[PDB]
């Protein structure tokens, strides 16, 4: 019926990119840079946050089936965003995406688009659709972060700080392969979990079951605390490596 | 696996012939070589490259893979023309959206006059369409182009709804700017005629009501070629739009611009006196001018006409076929 | 775009309805006879019928009743067309000049309504207070006959009884009372209402409802001396009036269905009944007077008089003469005599009127080798079945060959100097377990005879139950000589085998000329037949030989010879068979994308398919590959009655709604999509049901005939007997003639004030469109009959174009010559 879009961390050692001689650090950084390209391009064009995420999910899934050495990441990114606009009903003309991409890319980077940028992108749409197996509908952590937060009652400012901080973590997790490891529901819980730890909040108190240390169980079933820690660790690693620090 | 769409080739289907052309590409009737199952193939041509893959097809791929109901048509898979080897750029081949094959379409049956509908027949038809429409309206999807041209029927009496090319999501909290000319004029809701542009799920209910009347008279209730002539015909039967029956009619863009000849009174019950009392009440509510007072899909299911209809009794519509092939002496 | 021309060679011969009245004057007795789109006025004399006038209308006459409102010297006539055009007409004669005055006009079509299963019913009050119309189920429409209602404005009264069988106004009521039979789940009932013009609604009727026969068919309003009504059914006749109830159930009427009633004695003492077997009965009302002086009905009696034609409507013409309005055979004038003849009959045929009847099929053959076509038509049904040979002898010469059984298809085999005809006759299950024919007919009077002994379906599973008295069809192939028209041979097909298709041709390398018949095994339970045969016969030395048989899984609706191969349509399938050197049909290639492939036509390697609901498909045989290819399909939903190929690009179709259309390849190769789209470039409402299209022309060809502007000739036959010709025009001639029509429309006075454009508009219940691509030859050929002042008025400001001169002024004399050339095509 529907395809499986989730892999194990151990499997990422065997992407096409890895087996063509690309090392783990290079692919990982390329994913952040490619994702960020999609994020920045769509932000300049004023696109809804779901549209950016859908393009990023297509992009991440794409490079589970192809190598970065044979498909320029930025062309793929532009193509993903193009399709994402039509899927999420926030359409943009391909020429405008190229226009914005040229604005944000230097001369070397825009060389990936070749002599005819629009053509290189429009051509790729065929491969993209076959690659993602025409499974266009994608859910994102954002809707669950809000659906779950709405069931929290208590100090309005404390909960809103939790939401925004978690929301920031969701945006940052788009640069990582977490989109390929865990369903969005778990991601939304994980970012709530992380924000709670950083803000020294005890989220259970705001739930309908204030004496249920496991508030996540009423939102997401069969979620071990272990999973949430692995996700938190990866998000925090991105902040530790960069100069930016936890939002707080 | 069954889920890896877009790879299997169209060679696997034996084409029987062309059965239609609309929206993006032509529809063909085919038989699967392996299983022998009849299928319908919508050719999707991306060669234009103005906007690549048609968004009308994208909507129908996205929504119909989410929607599972016996009253909504199934997309079995998507298959491809023999693709150019090692030349992904040169490749201009088209995709085929594979649907379940439905025997007939309502329009052709009514148009040829070859279909007679009894009260019981009409119930089963509407009950399924509503079961489908409700399932879709509950998932916050709007069909936005209900027509006899795309209600499909099998000889068994099974109805399925089909043309999701214009279907989009509806958010109650955040009304979104939309496209006004969404349902075809013969089945257009008054609200869209006057420029509503912020449509409710009720727009699809109005069309189904028009069909309901079309099942008793065998003719579309409101037929016109101009957006204002349609309003006149609707106004004669349902009453002229007025603040008394439609409090927010003044907010509409073209309410002052578009006025009927008179302030007609509602005559629906009189002109449809021949309709059974249970259906007449359903028509009165489905064909209500104010979208907020217009009945919902579920409410039609909870009507004296439809609630106690049984799925087990298919009640297939009668087709003379061979009997009327030869003129009757 | 495409440009075509349609002309009526023979006017409709079938009778739709009849009433008699004092239309022209109170002194004159008049019989008004109605044929589709035609009105015929006569003055009835004891010597015969004398025609006063013949009128044409832009509409199919549905309702026709004669009424004389107080203050008129003569009766007026109400007419309602099938398009719901209504009119009141009055006779006016000034010396030698006759005109028909349109006193009132209006279209009574409602925006919302369901056409009744029984159809439009029309009646007029005995006091001429109102005209009653039941146009739609559940509604009763009233046109009040007031002096001021010149527009025939009307109102609807809600009617609870949705399925109404028949209705009449009653005599002898204090307020206008309708009596009608209706059907609901509990059976059929008779009920009465009173119509209040002041209240514009129904009031309780004079007498209560009664449950009546399940197959009660007709309602009779009995005159003042008796009052009440008579109800005619299949097995019983009943009289209803308040407390009075009489029922007679003679066994003679059960044998055949009675479908017409007419009053013989003005006081109601006698009524005439006719049935589908042609028998003529008399319902006699036996009076019993009380000492009070009140005349009451004592009993009812039915007496067989003789045999007439199957009557859709009957009329007594005073003296003893009775006009029999027949839709299936020749109409007649018959006198009912007091003494029976030596055979026991009281009926002797006086006058007989040619009716080409239903033309099921026809072929054009040059019998005399005079370079002139003769049209041999399968005409009539049941006892009235006949072969009609028609030639343009100037009047049309029609020879009749009585068959006394129903003809279905006809084909000509010159090699054998004979005609092959498919026929069916009605036998009835008898006490022997077999069946017995009601009368001898062509299939039983053949010189030599044979019966199929095929073992193909013999095994079957088990025989279905048979009840005595049930009807069955027996199908035959008739071999008929082309000169004597004598039945030379009759081949009876298997039991429960319906013959649908017939061809005469050579196949492959076989030098023999064969008769090939396609049949279907019809079982009452089967919605669609699933068994059939293609049978190859050879007519040689007075005997018909079975040469080969092919078993198919369906009904062989249509077959046609295709370049030495046999093209046959079996249900949804179109199939091409090769004729092997072993004299056996062999399949080659097939096409399955059809619902029911009813009709087939071929030109070269192109095949045209007509379908029960999917309109017309253009197929092609690709010889390099040995298979069919879909060229282009008409994607508009149309129910076909017949198809024809005009030329390689234009294809002609006939709809069951009495409409004709022409589809052409879109001739634009940009996209494969456009070529695959057949586009309906021509739309035209004929008013007739076309059963058969046949290429050919009856006009004499001396090789000296001036080359007419029209090119090509397709003849068509209709169910009402009308024969017409379709021919093509150049763009220059079409525009010239079309511009002339628009000029004629303003000049010629229309009966009922009916817009000509509306009458010829393509009309279906769901859609109504203006005519396109067709020139009404009848409108054009009427230019030669309008007065000179009108002729010159028509030609004012007329310019020829696209010709030798770009702009040329037209004179009234120039057009007279042009139209006269157009009258030479038929
Ligand atoms: C746009 C458009 N949207 N719609 C839903 C249609 C109807 N066309 C259709 N008709 C299906 N069956 C019914 C049917 C079956 C057979 C024949 C036929 C034709 C010629 C000869 C013999 N038979 C015609 C109709 C059907 N089944 C599945 N699909 C889709 C979902 C792919 C279908 N679409 C069209 S339009 N008008 O372009 O067509």
Short mmCIF file of N, CA, C and O in Angstrom, two decimals, chain C residues 231-329:
data_model
loop_
_atom_site.label_atom_id
_atom_site.label_comp_id
_atom_site.label_asym_id
_atom_site.label_seq_id
_atom_site.Cartn_x
_atom_site.Cartn_y
_atom_site.Cartn_z
N UNK C 231 -64.37 1.85 -19.13
CA UNK C 231 -62.95 1.55 -18.99
C UNK C 231 -62.64 0.27 -19.77
O UNK C 231 -63.21 -0.79 -19.48
N UNK C 232 -61.72 0.37 -20.73
CA UNK C 232 -61.34 -0.75 -21.59
C UNK C 232 -60.03 -1.33 -21.07
O UNK C 232 -59.05 -0.59 -20.85
N UNK C 233 -60.00 -2.65 -20.89
CA UNK C 233 -58.81 -3.35 -20.45
C UNK C 233 -58.44 -4.49 -21.38
O UNK C 233 -58.94 -4.55 -22.51
N UNK C 234 -57.57 -5.39 -20.93
CA UNK C 234 -57.21 -6.54 -21.75
C UNK C 234 -58.29 -7.61 -21.74
O UNK C 234 -58.60 -8.20 -22.79
N UNK C 235 -58.88 -7.87 -20.58
CA UNK C 235 -59.84 -8.95 -20.43
C UNK C 235 -61.24 -8.50 -20.04
O UNK C 235 -62.17 -9.31 -20.09
N UNK C 236 -61.43 -7.23 -19.66
CA UNK C 236 -62.71 -6.79 -19.14
C UNK C 236 -63.02 -5.37 -19.58
O UNK C 236 -62.12 -4.55 -19.79
N UNK C 237 -64.32 -5.09 -19.73
CA UNK C 237 -64.85 -3.76 -20.00
C UNK C 237 -65.80 -3.42 -18.87
O UNK C 237 -66.67 -4.24 -18.52
N UNK C 238 -65.65 -2.23 -18.29
CA UNK C 238 -66.43 -1.84 -17.13
C UNK C 238 -67.02 -0.45 -17.32
O UNK C 238 -66.38 0.43 -17.91
N UNK C 239 -68.24 -0.26 -16.83
CA UNK C 239 -68.92 1.03 -16.86
C UNK C 239 -69.06 1.54 -15.43
O UNK C 239 -69.50 0.79 -14.55
N UNK C 240 -68.70 2.80 -15.21
CA UNK C 240 -68.74 3.40 -13.88
C UNK C 240 -69.53 4.69 -13.92
O UNK C 240 -69.29 5.56 -14.76
N UNK C 241 -70.49 4.82 -12.99
CA UNK C 241 -71.20 6.09 -12.82
C UNK C 241 -71.85 6.07 -11.44
O UNK C 241 -72.95 5.54 -11.27
N UNK C 242 -71.18 6.67 -10.46
CA UNK C 242 -71.72 6.74 -9.12
C UNK C 242 -71.96 5.36 -8.54
O UNK C 242 -71.03 4.57 -8.33
N UNK C 243 -73.23 5.06 -8.26
CA UNK C 243 -73.60 3.76 -7.70
C UNK C 243 -73.64 2.66 -8.74
O UNK C 243 -73.53 1.48 -8.38
N UNK C 244 -73.81 3.00 -10.02
CA UNK C 244 -73.93 2.00 -11.08
C UNK C 244 -72.57 1.41 -11.43
O UNK C 244 -71.57 2.12 -11.53
N UNK C 245 -72.54 0.09 -11.63
CA UNK C 245 -71.32 -0.59 -12.06
C UNK C 245 -71.69 -1.83 -12.85
O UNK C 245 -72.35 -2.74 -12.32
N UNK C 246 -71.24 -1.89 -14.10
CA UNK C 246 -71.45 -3.03 -14.98
C UNK C 246 -70.10 -3.48 -15.52
O UNK C 246 -69.25 -2.65 -15.86
N UNK C 247 -69.91 -4.80 -15.61
CA UNK C 247 -68.66 -5.37 -16.07
C UNK C 247 -68.94 -6.55 -16.99
O UNK C 247 -69.62 -7.50 -16.59
N UNK C 248 -68.42 -6.49 -18.21
CA UNK C 248 -68.51 -7.56 -19.19
C UNK C 248 -67.09 -8.01 -19.50
O UNK C 248 -66.21 -7.18 -19.73
N UNK C 249 -66.88 -9.33 -19.52
CA UNK C 249 -65.56 -9.92 -19.76
C UNK C 249 -65.68 -10.99 -20.83
O UNK C 249 -65.59 -12.19 -20.55
N UNK C 250 -65.90 -10.59 -22.09
CA UNK C 250 -66.03 -11.58 -23.15
C UNK C 250 -64.70 -12.24 -23.43
O UNK C 250 -63.63 -11.62 -23.29
N UNK C 251 -64.70 -13.53 -23.82
CA UNK C 251 -63.42 -14.20 -24.08
C UNK C 251 -62.77 -13.77 -25.38
O UNK C 251 -61.58 -14.03 -25.57
N UNK C 252 -63.51 -13.10 -26.27
CA UNK C 252 -62.96 -12.77 -27.58
C UNK C 252 -61.93 -11.66 -27.45
O UNK C 252 -60.90 -11.66 -28.14
N UNK C 253 -62.17 -10.68 -26.57
CA UNK C 253 -61.26 -9.55 -26.46
C UNK C 253 -59.92 -9.97 -25.85
O UNK C 253 -58.90 -9.32 -26.07
N UNK C 254 -59.91 -11.04 -25.05
CA UNK C 254 -58.67 -11.45 -24.40
C UNK C 254 -57.59 -11.82 -25.41
O UNK C 254 -56.40 -11.70 -25.11
N UNK C 255 -57.99 -12.27 -26.60
CA UNK C 255 -57.03 -12.76 -27.58
C UNK C 255 -56.07 -11.67 -28.06
O UNK C 255 -54.91 -11.96 -28.37
N UNK C 256 -56.53 -10.42 -28.15
CA UNK C 256 -55.71 -9.34 -28.67
C UNK C 256 -56.01 -8.04 -27.93
O UNK C 256 -57.15 -7.77 -27.54
N UNK C 257 -54.97 -7.23 -27.75
CA UNK C 257 -55.10 -6.00 -26.98
C UNK C 257 -55.87 -4.93 -27.76
O UNK C 257 -55.60 -4.69 -28.94
N UNK C 258 -56.83 -4.30 -27.09
CA UNK C 258 -57.62 -3.22 -27.68
C UNK C 258 -56.96 -1.89 -27.32
O UNK C 258 -56.71 -1.61 -26.14
N UNK C 259 -56.70 -1.05 -28.33
CA UNK C 259 -55.98 0.20 -28.13
C UNK C 259 -56.70 1.42 -28.68
O UNK C 259 -56.13 2.51 -28.66
N UNK C 260 -57.91 1.28 -29.23
CA UNK C 260 -58.63 2.44 -29.74
C UNK C 260 -60.14 2.33 -29.51
O UNK C 260 -60.72 1.25 -29.58
N UNK C 261 -60.76 3.49 -29.27
CA UNK C 261 -62.20 3.60 -29.09
C UNK C 261 -62.72 4.85 -29.79
O UNK C 261 -62.09 5.90 -29.74
N UNK C 262 -63.88 4.72 -30.43
CA UNK C 262 -64.57 5.83 -31.09
C UNK C 262 -66.06 5.65 -30.89
O UNK C 262 -66.58 4.53 -30.87
N UNK C 263 -66.77 6.77 -30.78
CA UNK C 263 -68.22 6.75 -30.58
C UNK C 263 -68.93 6.69 -31.92
O UNK C 263 -68.65 7.49 -32.82
N UNK C 264 -69.86 5.74 -32.04
CA UNK C 264 -70.59 5.52 -33.29
C UNK C 264 -71.91 6.28 -33.22
O UNK C 264 -72.19 7.12 -34.09
N UNK C 265 -72.73 5.99 -32.21
CA UNK C 265 -74.01 6.69 -32.02
C UNK C 265 -73.83 7.89 -31.10
O UNK C 265 -73.28 7.73 -30.00
N UNK C 266 -74.27 9.08 -31.50
CA UNK C 266 -73.96 10.29 -30.72
C UNK C 266 -74.43 10.25 -29.28
O UNK C 266 -73.80 10.87 -28.41
N UNK C 267 -75.51 9.54 -29.00
CA UNK C 267 -76.02 9.42 -27.64
C UNK C 267 -75.27 8.38 -26.82
O UNK C 267 -75.59 8.21 -25.63
N UNK C 268 -74.28 7.71 -27.40
CA UNK C 268 -73.46 6.76 -26.68
C UNK C 268 -73.93 5.33 -26.74
O UNK C 268 -73.34 4.47 -26.07
N UNK C 269 -74.95 5.03 -27.54
CA UNK C 269 -75.51 3.69 -27.58
C UNK C 269 -74.55 2.70 -28.25
O UNK C 269 -74.72 1.49 -28.08
N UNK C 270 -73.57 3.18 -29.02
CA UNK C 270 -72.60 2.32 -29.68
C UNK C 270 -71.21 2.94 -29.65
O UNK C 270 -71.07 4.16 -29.79
N UNK C 271 -70.20 2.11 -29.41
CA UNK C 271 -68.79 2.50 -29.47
C UNK C 271 -68.02 1.46 -30.28
O UNK C 271 -68.33 0.26 -30.22
N UNK C 272 -66.98 1.90 -30.99
CA UNK C 272 -66.16 1.02 -31.82
C UNK C 272 -64.83 0.76 -31.13
O UNK C 272 -64.17 1.69 -30.66
N UNK C 273 -64.43 -0.51 -31.10
CA UNK C 273 -63.20 -0.96 -30.46
C UNK C 273 -62.35 -1.68 -31.51
O UNK C 273 -62.88 -2.47 -32.30
N UNK C 274 -61.05 -1.44 -31.50
CA UNK C 274 -60.14 -2.13 -32.39
C UNK C 274 -58.95 -2.70 -31.63
O UNK C 274 -58.54 -2.19 -30.59
N UNK C 275 -58.40 -3.79 -32.18
CA UNK C 275 -57.30 -4.48 -31.52
C UNK C 275 -56.14 -4.68 -32.49
O UNK C 275 -56.26 -4.48 -33.70
N UNK C 276 -55.00 -5.10 -31.92
CA UNK C 276 -53.74 -5.19 -32.65
C UNK C 276 -53.76 -6.27 -33.72
O UNK C 276 -52.88 -6.27 -34.59
N UNK C 277 -54.71 -7.19 -33.68
CA UNK C 277 -54.85 -8.17 -34.74
C UNK C 277 -55.78 -7.68 -35.85
O UNK C 277 -56.07 -8.44 -36.78
N UNK C 278 -56.24 -6.44 -35.77
CA UNK C 278 -57.08 -5.86 -36.79
C UNK C 278 -58.57 -6.12 -36.66
O UNK C 278 -59.34 -5.62 -37.49
N UNK C 279 -59.00 -6.86 -35.65
CA UNK C 279 -60.43 -7.13 -35.51
C UNK C 279 -61.15 -5.88 -35.04
O UNK C 279 -60.64 -5.11 -34.22
N UNK C 280 -62.35 -5.67 -35.57
CA UNK C 280 -63.19 -4.52 -35.25
C UNK C 280 -64.40 -4.99 -34.47
O UNK C 280 -65.16 -5.85 -34.95
N UNK C 281 -64.59 -4.43 -33.27
CA UNK C 281 -65.67 -4.80 -32.37
C UNK C 281 -66.63 -3.62 -32.21
O UNK C 281 -66.37 -2.51 -32.66
N UNK C 282 -67.76 -3.89 -31.56
CA UNK C 282 -68.72 -2.84 -31.21
C UNK C 282 -69.19 -3.03 -29.78
O UNK C 282 -69.76 -4.07 -29.44
N UNK C 283 -68.97 -2.02 -28.94
CA UNK C 283 -69.48 -2.04 -27.57
C UNK C 283 -70.87 -1.42 -27.61
O UNK C 283 -71.02 -0.22 -27.86
N UNK C 284 -71.90 -2.24 -27.39
CA UNK C 284 -73.29 -1.82 -27.46
C UNK C 284 -73.80 -1.53 -26.05
O UNK C 284 -73.61 -2.35 -25.14
N UNK C 285 -74.45 -0.38 -25.88
CA UNK C 285 -75.06 -0.01 -24.61
C UNK C 285 -76.56 -0.24 -24.70
O UNK C 285 -77.27 0.47 -25.42
N UNK C 286 -77.05 -1.25 -23.97
CA UNK C 286 -78.45 -1.65 -23.98
C UNK C 286 -79.24 -0.83 -22.96
O UNK C 286 -79.01 -0.94 -21.76
N UNK C 287 -80.16 0.00 -23.46
CA UNK C 287 -80.89 0.92 -22.60
C UNK C 287 -82.08 0.26 -21.91
O UNK C 287 -82.75 -0.61 -22.49
N UNK C 288 -82.31 0.65 -20.66
CA UNK C 288 -83.50 0.27 -19.89
C UNK C 288 -84.09 1.52 -19.24
O UNK C 288 -83.46 2.10 -18.34
N UNK C 289 -85.26 1.95 -19.68
CA UNK C 289 -85.91 3.12 -19.12
C UNK C 289 -86.85 2.75 -17.97
O UNK C 289 -87.53 1.72 -18.02
N UNK C 290 -86.87 3.59 -16.94
CA UNK C 290 -87.78 3.42 -15.81
C UNK C 290 -89.05 4.23 -16.07
O UNK C 290 -89.08 5.13 -16.92
N UNK C 291 -90.12 3.90 -15.34
CA UNK C 291 -91.37 4.64 -15.49
C UNK C 291 -91.16 6.13 -15.21
O UNK C 291 -91.89 6.97 -15.75
N UNK C 292 -90.17 6.46 -14.38
CA UNK C 292 -89.82 7.86 -14.15
C UNK C 292 -89.39 8.56 -15.42
O UNK C 292 -89.46 9.79 -15.50
N UNK C 293 -88.95 7.81 -16.44
CA UNK C 293 -88.36 8.39 -17.62
C UNK C 293 -86.85 8.49 -17.62
O UNK C 293 -86.28 8.94 -18.62
N UNK C 294 -86.19 8.07 -16.54
CA UNK C 294 -84.74 8.12 -16.47
C UNK C 294 -84.15 6.95 -17.27
O UNK C 294 -84.50 5.79 -17.03
N UNK C 295 -83.27 7.27 -18.21
CA UNK C 295 -82.62 6.26 -19.04
C UNK C 295 -81.40 5.76 -18.28
O UNK C 295 -80.51 6.55 -17.93
N UNK C 296 -81.35 4.46 -18.01
CA UNK C 296 -80.24 3.82 -17.33
C UNK C 296 -79.61 2.76 -18.22
O UNK C 296 -80.25 2.23 -19.13
N UNK C 297 -78.34 2.47 -17.96
CA UNK C 297 -77.63 1.45 -18.71
C UNK C 297 -77.97 0.07 -18.15
O UNK C 297 -77.80 -0.18 -16.95
N UNK C 298 -78.45 -0.82 -19.02
CA UNK C 298 -78.87 -2.15 -18.60
C UNK C 298 -77.73 -3.15 -18.63
O UNK C 298 -77.51 -3.87 -17.65
N UNK C 299 -77.00 -3.21 -19.74
CA UNK C 299 -75.90 -4.15 -19.87
C UNK C 299 -75.02 -3.71 -21.04
O UNK C 299 -75.39 -2.84 -21.83
N UNK C 300 -73.85 -4.34 -21.14
CA UNK C 300 -72.88 -4.09 -22.19
C UNK C 300 -72.67 -5.38 -22.98
O UNK C 300 -72.66 -6.47 -22.41
N UNK C 301 -72.51 -5.24 -24.30
CA UNK C 301 -72.31 -6.37 -25.19
C UNK C 301 -71.28 -5.99 -26.24
O UNK C 301 -71.25 -4.84 -26.69
N UNK C 302 -70.43 -6.95 -26.62
CA UNK C 302 -69.42 -6.73 -27.64
C UNK C 302 -69.68 -7.72 -28.78
O UNK C 302 -69.89 -8.91 -28.54
N UNK C 303 -69.67 -7.22 -30.02
CA UNK C 303 -69.95 -8.03 -31.20
C UNK C 303 -68.85 -7.82 -32.23
O UNK C 303 -68.54 -6.68 -32.60
N UNK C 304 -68.27 -8.92 -32.70
CA UNK C 304 -67.25 -8.85 -33.75
C UNK C 304 -67.90 -8.56 -35.10
O UNK C 304 -68.87 -9.22 -35.49
N UNK C 305 -67.38 -7.55 -35.79
CA UNK C 305 -67.86 -7.13 -37.11
C UNK C 305 -67.02 -7.66 -38.26
O UNK C 305 -67.57 -8.05 -39.29
N UNK C 306 -65.70 -7.68 -38.11
CA UNK C 306 -64.83 -8.12 -39.19
C UNK C 306 -63.39 -7.76 -38.88
O UNK C 306 -63.01 -7.64 -37.72
N UNK C 307 -62.60 -7.58 -39.94
CA UNK C 307 -61.20 -7.24 -39.76
C UNK C 307 -60.89 -5.91 -40.45
O UNK C 307 -61.31 -5.67 -41.59
N UNK C 308 -60.14 -5.07 -39.75
CA UNK C 308 -59.64 -3.79 -40.23
C UNK C 308 -58.12 -3.75 -40.05
O UNK C 308 -57.50 -4.75 -39.66
N UNK C 309 -57.52 -2.61 -40.37
CA UNK C 309 -56.12 -2.39 -40.04
C UNK C 309 -55.94 -2.06 -38.56
O UNK C 309 -56.84 -1.55 -37.89
N UNK C 310 -54.75 -2.37 -38.04
CA UNK C 310 -54.40 -2.01 -36.68
C UNK C 310 -54.53 -0.50 -36.55
O UNK C 310 -53.90 0.26 -37.30
N UNK C 311 -55.36 -0.04 -35.62
CA UNK C 311 -55.74 1.37 -35.54
C UNK C 311 -55.13 2.00 -34.31
O UNK C 311 -55.38 1.55 -33.19
N UNK C 312 -54.32 3.05 -34.51
CA UNK C 312 -53.94 3.90 -33.39
C UNK C 312 -55.13 4.76 -32.97
O UNK C 312 -55.33 5.02 -31.78
N UNK C 313 -55.93 5.19 -33.95
CA UNK C 313 -57.14 5.97 -33.72
C UNK C 313 -58.21 5.52 -34.72
O UNK C 313 -57.88 5.11 -35.84
N UNK C 314 -59.48 5.58 -34.31
CA UNK C 314 -60.63 5.26 -35.15
C UNK C 314 -61.58 6.45 -35.27
O UNK C 314 -61.66 7.29 -34.38
N UNK C 315 -62.31 6.49 -36.40
CA UNK C 315 -63.30 7.53 -36.67
C UNK C 315 -64.47 6.99 -37.48
O UNK C 315 -64.26 6.38 -38.53
N UNK C 316 -65.70 7.20 -36.99
CA UNK C 316 -66.91 6.88 -37.74
C UNK C 316 -67.25 8.07 -38.62
O UNK C 316 -67.33 9.21 -38.13
N UNK C 317 -67.43 7.83 -39.93
CA UNK C 317 -67.67 8.88 -40.90
C UNK C 317 -69.12 8.95 -41.38
O UNK C 317 -69.38 9.35 -42.52
N UNK C 318 -70.08 8.66 -40.51
CA UNK C 318 -71.49 8.74 -40.88
C UNK C 318 -71.75 7.83 -42.07
O UNK C 318 -70.81 7.27 -42.65
N UNK C 319 -73.02 7.66 -42.46
CA UNK C 319 -73.40 6.65 -43.45
C UNK C 319 -73.01 5.35 -42.74
O UNK C 319 -73.54 5.09 -41.65
N UNK C 320 -72.10 4.55 -43.27
CA UNK C 320 -71.56 3.43 -42.53
C UNK C 320 -70.05 3.49 -42.54
O UNK C 320 -69.38 2.63 -41.94
N UNK C 321 -69.50 4.54 -43.15
CA UNK C 321 -68.07 4.63 -43.41
C UNK C 321 -67.31 4.94 -42.13
O UNK C 321 -67.71 5.80 -41.33
N UNK C 322 -66.18 4.26 -41.94
CA UNK C 322 -65.33 4.40 -40.76
C UNK C 322 -63.90 4.50 -41.28
O UNK C 322 -63.44 3.61 -42.00
N UNK C 323 -63.19 5.57 -40.90
CA UNK C 323 -61.78 5.71 -41.27
C UNK C 323 -60.92 5.05 -40.20
O UNK C 323 -61.09 5.32 -39.01
N UNK C 324 -59.98 4.21 -40.64
CA UNK C 324 -59.12 3.45 -39.75
C UNK C 324 -57.74 4.10 -39.79
O UNK C 324 -57.03 3.99 -40.80
N UNK C 325 -57.35 4.77 -38.71
CA UNK C 325 -56.04 5.39 -38.68
C UNK C 325 -54.99 4.40 -38.23
O UNK C 325 -54.93 4.01 -37.06
N UNK C 326 -54.13 4.02 -39.17
CA UNK C 326 -53.14 2.98 -38.96
C UNK C 326 -51.74 3.57 -38.99
O UNK C 326 -51.41 4.39 -39.85
N UNK C 327 -50.91 3.11 -38.06
CA UNK C 327 -49.51 3.48 -38.00
C UNK C 327 -48.60 2.36 -38.49
O UNK C 327 -47.43 2.63 -38.80
N UNK C 328 -49.12 1.13 -38.58
CA UNK C 328 -48.35 -0.03 -38.99
C UNK C 328 -48.68 -0.56 -40.37
O UNK C 328 -47.89 -1.33 -40.92
N UNK C 329 -49.82 -0.17 -40.94
CA UNK C 329 -50.20 -0.65 -42.26
C UNK C 329 -51.04 0.37 -42.99
O UNK C 329 -51.17 1.51 -42.55
#
